[PDB]
Write a protein that binds this ligand. Structure first.
Ligand SMILES: Nc1ncnc2c1ncn2CCCCNS(=O)(=O)NC(=O)CCCC[C@@H]1SC[C@@H]2NC(=O)N[C@@H]21
Ligand SMILES: Nc1ncnc2c1ncn2CCCCNS(=O)(=O)NC(=O)CCCC[C@@H]1SC[C@@H]2NC(=O)N[C@@H]21
Lengths: 322, 322
């Protein structure tokens, strides 16, 4: 229904109080009968809405579906995010962000319950199971130099890690430069692209995929031993809206840190949260591939590596396997 | 008409021979009467088409309007350009290229007879007079490292300069890093943007604006002393199709040079074609602005500058005025 999101938004905004159906009707300039029909539909879609006879309605719990009217409430209260686009299915939120950013200077994000052509780094396929993960692309407008842009990944990694950690009973670690792990399982990967020239950056687009409630059987046989979800490390039922709120809050906090603090101020924190140390790694560089150890993380965020031939390397980035 | 471009394309492809209206009809599976109606329309739009009684039709000259069916012939015979989009009016060919490149790996360009929101570097307004200039954006897919990408501007500058020089009786010079001049007048500026991350480049988009036939009165009073067009330096009537062909040929040649030769191999040529030497320049760097002289152009394409305080600088880029 056309007013379904608006009814949902009024229910969300009035928590924890009940609102009468009459009040919803006067707000949306529709009939009492249209409001009850919308509320039935929302209940059908799995919204837990308590209705009592003289009080009205109380949104108790959302289903595992993204709802524009709810996310709209998140962007209205965000200084950073001007708006959001919430899709049920899409080729890729990253493809949609790169089209939507052209010709404007807005900061926004794009969410989809499923992706049919999710892509990771180097155009590797990314599994985006409907209803089971957060598939999102974030467009921001950092007015920064190239010598500074690579640090965004280091800061954002810590925000994602903290957001996940808030819901994980197990330790959440960061695999430099763009992987979040729980024990031995990849729970998130992200990818940051930019539109730029030597005069500056028009936008960055950070594509974030986080496995929320996959059962092991929900991962393809090829990635099952290296993928995990937040639910597999949470004694309580993970609530995708509670997590998204925490995740937007940490992204905002770490983005403002990235714009105002040198990497030196999170370097120790980043090292302490990393899981790449004391462990041999597999580096892929075009056709060649070599092994190495992560020795240090310098003040610019570069990984210092000792390869198997004993040579040292200072890497702004790499793709490494365990 | 739906078959107007196809009729035009057949006329172009058969130069310098006449083709009968019957032959056009059998090729397009339309009637002899529809073909003559299309040819009348094309003549109305300013196509010079010779028609003789038993021979058919010969395209003699195109008007100052871009025609998809003609440009299609250019991309079919180009190894590099997969396709093109030809618009009569657009906000900006650069905005359209950045939308069109998403989700594919095609190399292509976008042409528009006019732009309503043309933008140069730093979002400075760009005047795109309808029918008087070439407003185009070129999307390419260089598989190259960032240490190499800045050289593209140096190579492409030489292609544009040569294309213009072929039609100018006066000397065409290059103002580093993205201006083409004829004597004291800016005849072209271009702007190269990229979509990229530390793993590589998804695309570059080179926005090229070239003044073709502006009379001085056609330039705004604010830019008239610093802008010029090719026609103002050509004794013959500049033909936009002949120029576009030459320009696509030089762009292709210099792009392949950029992918296969170090800048050292065009360095002397670039220096010899530059007009920034032996002349004080105005540098703008955020809020500050200083004066300086261009001392050299190193092997990486960096401008070596002596500023007014006597300090040396090595600039991958800058915005400089005369
Ligand atoms: N669900 C999965 N869970 C764990 N492992 C998996 C999964 N599927 C594939 N594998 C294994 C290969 C891992 C790929 N290698 S990677 O590139 O280094 N890693 C990355 O994380 C970069 C991908 C970011 C994804 C986001 S989703 C929203 C946005 N839109 C879009 O299209 N992309 C971004
Ligand atoms: N017609 C003009 N002739 C001479 N001078 C002029 C003119 N109009 C403005 N001025 C003065 C300010 C000069 C601006 N400063 S700049 O940025 O350093 N110079 C540049 O050349 C970069 C602009 C590239 C334009 C292309 S057109 C197709 C594509 N689509 C789009 O939107 N852009 C690109």
């Amino acid at each position: 229904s056309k007013y379904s999101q608006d009814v949902l938004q009024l229910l969300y905004k009035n928590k924890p109080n009940y609102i009468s159906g009459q009040s919803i009707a006067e707000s949306l300039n529709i009939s009492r009968t249209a409001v009850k029909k919308v509320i039935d539909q929302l209940k059908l879609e799995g919204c837990k809405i308590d209705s009592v006879n003289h009080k009205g309605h109380l949104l108790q719990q959302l289903p595992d579906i993204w709802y524009q009217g709810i996310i709209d409430q998140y962007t209205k209260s965000s200084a950073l995010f001007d708006f959001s686009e919430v899709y049920d299915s899409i080729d890729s939120t990253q493809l949609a962000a790169k089209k939507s950013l052209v010709g404007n200077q807005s900061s926004f994000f794009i969410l989809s319950d499923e992706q049919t052509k999710g892509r990771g780094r180097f155009n590797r396929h990314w599994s985006s199971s409907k209803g089971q993960g957060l598939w999102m692309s974030v467009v921001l407008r950092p007015n920064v130099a190239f010598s500074m842009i690579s640090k965004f990944n280091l800061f954002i990694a810590l925000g994602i890690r903290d957001a996940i950690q808030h819901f994980s009973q197990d330790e959440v670690k960061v695999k430099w430069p763009n992987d979040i792990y729980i024990d031995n399982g990849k729970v998130c990967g992200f990818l940051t692209e930019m539109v730029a020239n030597n005069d500056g950056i028009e936008a960055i687009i950070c594509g974030i995929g986080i496995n929320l409630t996959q059962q092991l059987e929900n991962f393809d046989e090829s990635i099952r031993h290296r993928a995990t979800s937040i639910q597999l490390h949470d004694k309580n039922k993970l609530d995708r809206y509670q997590f998204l709120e925490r995740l937007l809050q940490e992204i905002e906090k770490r983005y403002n840190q990235f714009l105002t603090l040198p990497f030196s101020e999170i370097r120790e924190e980043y090292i302490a949260a990393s899981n790449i140390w004391n462990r041999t790694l597999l580096f892929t560089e075009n056709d060649k591939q070599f092994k190495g150890q992560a020795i240090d993380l310098d003040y610019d965020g570069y990984l210092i590596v000792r390869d198997e031939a004993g040579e040292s390397h200072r890497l702004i980035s790499a793709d490494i396997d365990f």
